[PDB]
Amino acid sequence: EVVTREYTINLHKRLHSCTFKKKAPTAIKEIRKFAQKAMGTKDVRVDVKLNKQIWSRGIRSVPRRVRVRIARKRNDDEDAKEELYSLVTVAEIPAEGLKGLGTKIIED
Amino acid sequence: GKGTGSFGKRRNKTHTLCVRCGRRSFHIQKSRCSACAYPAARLRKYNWSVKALRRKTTGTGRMRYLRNVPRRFKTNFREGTEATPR
Amino acid sequence: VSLKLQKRLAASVLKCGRGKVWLDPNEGNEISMANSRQNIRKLVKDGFIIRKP
Amino acid sequence: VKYSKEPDNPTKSCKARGSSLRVHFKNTRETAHALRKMPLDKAKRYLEDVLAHKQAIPFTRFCRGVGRTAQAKNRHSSGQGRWPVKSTKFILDLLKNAESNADVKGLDVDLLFISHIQVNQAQKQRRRTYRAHGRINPYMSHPCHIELTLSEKE
Amino acid sequence: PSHKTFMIKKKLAKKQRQNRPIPYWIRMRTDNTIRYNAKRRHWRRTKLGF
Amino acid sequence: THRGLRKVACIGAWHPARVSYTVARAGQNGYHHRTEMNKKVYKLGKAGQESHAAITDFDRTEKDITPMGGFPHYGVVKDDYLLIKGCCVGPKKRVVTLRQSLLNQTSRVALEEIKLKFIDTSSKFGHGRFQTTQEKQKFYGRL
RNA sequence: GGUAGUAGCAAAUAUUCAAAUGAGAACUUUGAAGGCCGAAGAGGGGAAAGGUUCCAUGUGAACGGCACUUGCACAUGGGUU
RNA sequence: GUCUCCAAGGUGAACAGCCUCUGGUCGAUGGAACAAUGUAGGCAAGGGAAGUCGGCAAAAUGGAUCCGUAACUUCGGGAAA
RNA sequence: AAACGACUCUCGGCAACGGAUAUCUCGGCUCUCGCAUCGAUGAAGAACGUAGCGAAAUGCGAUACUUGGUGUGAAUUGCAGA
Ligand SMILES: [K+]
Ligand SMILES: [K+]
Ligand SMILES: [K+]
Ligand SMILES: [K+]
Ligand SMILES: [K+]
Ligand SMILES: [K+]
Ligand SMILES: [Mg+2]
Ligand SMILES: [Mg+2]
Ligand SMILES: [Mg+2]
Ligand SMILES: [Mg+2]
Ligand SMILES: [Mg+2]
Ligand SMILES: [Mg+2]
Ligand SMILES: [Mg+2]
Ligand SMILES: [Zn+2]
């Protein structure tokens, strides 16, 4: 199915004691695995803006918590091995912040 | 330092190509060839190197003129004449 | 397609470093068609090749 | 060409082979040993899993210093096994060629199984390395010949 | 070097001309034994030693 | 020491020409079966019987055996429990077997009647300074 | 041959995301981001030495100690006023 | 290993170290884990050379300003005592 | 229950690796015979060029894998053209 949801991902605990030079790339891999588990799609694409946000503070200072939007969409290409894929983009942080914020269904 | 480090300094040619024998054996500072002793009039050759003599002896080259001598001898060096007209 | 030649020629024509040349990622096919400095100048005039600040 | 083993009934069999394939002889031997007598479809699925790192090729003869894994437990009790992707890719290509030959022959692929499969050493190719104290050592490859035959069960 | 004598340059030109594969039609000649150019040279493998 | 210093220098003499079983060697450490003797029972907490709580005669504060924030890596103790002097084998949550003594306990230490005066229940996930959550809340003005 | 698919591939801070091509992309190209060289440089030229390695197009095999769609490799052309 | 020309901003005495601009570049086969033993780099309560052939290694000191500076001396120094 | 399998070893068929063996040879080695002919009228050697399509070998010298005379008498040949 085609479903869009917004998640809060606790990268701080997933990257605990990660070697500095591999922290941000490990963060990208961590987000990819999170998307795979949440949507069940092996093929996950990370938006350039989200990649910028992860790397915005260097290779060490990955944000502790990141709000992302994950959309499972049908892959139109016929040669593609997988029928569905997941797109991970940045999500807007409410004024109150991330405190009290759970998982939301975005699709109208 | 006498090994690999020392080999890093090789950019001055002791020898260049020889005018006479064409080998890279012309000692620039001595101004003489270690292979043929150019510019000495006589060629440098020694009996203690039979291989060196056979590398450069007569017949190893072209023999532009010499190769034709036996043919002229067989005719007794006939000159100034032609075959009878057809 | 590779645009290495176009990048080098644009760097030369713009009189800037190769790291300050911007080749439009959406105009790859038409940029690749240019093989002479005249074509590079035409592309620069058209705005497909820009010197970055 | 004459294969090492000829089928009992050639009319109901197909063959494929490769010569001087640029793959390690020992890994190829291990995977071929793993594949013998298996049905064609099961062999294809097994090799695909090996490429996906879901099933392992048990390393049995050329196993000195090989790591151990739980994946090869059912085939090799000691657990020694690996996932040589190059050898399985070449053997899968040869199996596809054999299947195409069977299709041309008119055989039905459902009951096909690997009657025979063998890996032989091909001619070694030469490169070299540089060792301490100004020495040079051989740096060789070990290509292999691969042949297989598919037969109709029963 | 950029500075080179005329004679050395001519010798280098001859060496460049001699560095090519044999014509294909040589292999079709009756009673041919030449398989390739056995005297091929690469600037990084064997130096001319001039 | 060339080639490292965390070693046994000489692992044996020339003769016998074999390494013996008595020489220290690197190998598995921990996860060994052990039997520890003479661990005195200081209290037997019975669930819902007023002996489960950590209240003593001297200290009348109403509190449970479980420390502030729970037992680290274990949880909340609610069933019967034994408070034993000293330490016992294994990490937290490890199942341990309790064995009746095989010896005759006649020593003065074994016969001693211990009377608990104070049982600490402060948080063990740090330098706990409060005994109860209510005490901390009163201290910080939130109660 | 055994050794053995073993010893090893570890200095010079570091890569990541999307797209294009391709049978095949961690390694090719484009864009974005995050880093390094930090002007007695990992920048820009010469002397010696090398001799076509220079530039364009294309690429079976070998080589580029993993890989390559790639290239100081290979093949065909051009270039030093 | 191999001669030489050009040489920005900040800090700072300083073509010291550290960061940055132009220019260049991420080229050192990649992935997972974080056992022993290693290599390189730190810390460690109390004691302070008891270690060792031997203070080996490490630690301690360190810039600038002010005060002050012994024996000895070839009268110059010692002295940054 | 040490059976089936794996490993090692062993024997046989087949397939590999390698190039021994046998059969060859426009080459070598040895003996014998005939002749006497390099060069300032520029030798030997050395360099560079030269073919429709050649790098090497062979040949040749801007008349450049050949010009001319004579002999022989229908080719050269890998391809194309004359
Ligand atoms: K192993
Ligand atoms: K390609
Ligand atoms: K001491
Ligand atoms: K002593
Ligand atoms: K056999
Ligand atoms: K003639
Ligand atoms: Mg002179
Ligand atoms: Mg080496
Ligand atoms: Mg604690
Ligand atoms: Mg300077
Ligand atoms: Mg080039
Ligand atoms: Mg200043
Ligand atoms: Mg023979
Ligand atoms: Zn000479």
* Chain E: touching chains (3 or more CB pairs < 8 Å): B
Q: Which residue is nearest to nucleotide I58 (CA to C1')?
A: B62
CA D61 to C1' I9, whole Å: 14
- Determined by cryo-EM
Tokens of F136: 């901390």
Nearest CA in chain B to E48: B24
Give one DSSP letter per residue of B14-60, joined into a string. Answer: SEE--TTT-SS-EETTTTEETTT-TTSSS----TT-HHHHHHHSTTS
Residue C42 to residues A44, C2, C16, C19, F41, Cα–Cα distance (Å): 40, 19, 17, 20, 93
Instruction: Tell how far CA A58 is from the center of its chain.
Output: 18
Tokens of E23: 């014509």
Q: What's the number of CA atoms in the CB half-sphere (13 Å) around residue B67?
A: 6
- CB-based burial of residue F13 (10 Å sphere; 0-12 exposed, 13-18 middle, 19+ buried)? exposed
> Are residues F45 and F83 in contact, defined by beta-carbon separation less than 8 angstroms?
yes
Pairing of strands A84-90, A44-46: parallel
Tokens of F133: 């959550």
Please state, in angstroms and rounded to a whole number, the distance separating the CA atoms of residues F58 and F83. 18
Residue C35 identity: N
Please state, in angstroms and rounded to a whole number, the distance separating the CA atoms of residues B14 and B30. 9
Degrees (nearest 5) of the Cα angle B15, B21, B26? 15
> Are residues F110 and F38 in contact, defined by beta-carbon separation less than 8 angstroms?
yes
Resolution of this entry, Å:
2.1
Give one DSSP letter per residue of F25-56, joined into a string. Answer: -----S----------EEEEE-TTTTSSB---
Please state, in angstroms and rounded to a whole number, the distance separating the CA atoms of residues F4 and D62. 34
Please state, in angstroms and rounded to a whole number, the distance separating the CA atoms of residues D32 and D148. 9
CA E29 to C1' H73, whole Å: 102
Residue A80 identity: A
SS3 sequence of D33-87: HHHCCCEHHHHHHHHHHHHCCCCCEECCCCCCCCCECCCCCCCCCCCEEECCHHH
Beta strands of A1-108 (E only): which ranges? 3-10, 44-46, 65-74, 84-90, 104-105
- Answer whether B24 sits within 8 Å of E49, measured CB to CB: yes
Residue F119 identity: I
- Answer whether B17 sits within 8 Å of E50, measured CB to CB: yes
The CA distance from E28 to the nearest CA of chain B, in Å, is 30
> Are residues F71 and F77 in contact, defined by beta-carbon separation less than 8 angstroms?
yes
Long-range contacts of F73-80 (CB under 8 A, 24+ apart): F77/F45, F78/F47, F79/F47, F80/F44, F80/F45, F80/F46, F80/F47, F80/F52
Pairing of strands D112-121, D144-152: antiparallel
Q: Chain B, 18-37: which have a CB under 8 Å from a chain E CB?
A: 24
Consult the annotation and say whether D130 binds a ligand: yes
Examine chains F and D and say if they touch (3+ CB pairs below 8 A): no
Residue F41 to residues D10, D35, F102, F116, F122, Cα–Cα distance (Å): 83, 63, 16, 12, 22
Contact list in E for residue B16 (CB cut-off 8 A) is: 50
Instruction: Tell how far CA F56 is from the center of its chain.
Output: 21
> Are residues C6 and C23 in contact, defined by beta-carbon separation less than 8 angstroms?
yes
The nt closest to B77 (CA vs C1′) is I37
DSSP letter assigned to residue A42: S
Buried b (16+ CB within 10 A) or exposed e, F25-60: eeeeeeeeeeeeeeeeeebebeeeeeebbbbeeeee
The CA distance from E43 to the nearest CA of chain B, in Å, is 17
- Answer whether E7 sits within 8 Å of B17, measured CB to CB: yes
Pairing of strands D112-121, D126-131: unpaired
Q: Does B45 lie at the interface with E, CB-CB under 8 angstroms? A: no
- Answer whether B17 sits within 8 Å of E49, measured CB to CB: no
Helix/strand/coil for A83: coil
Name residues with Cβ closer than 5 Å to ligand 7, which is an ion. Answer: B 31
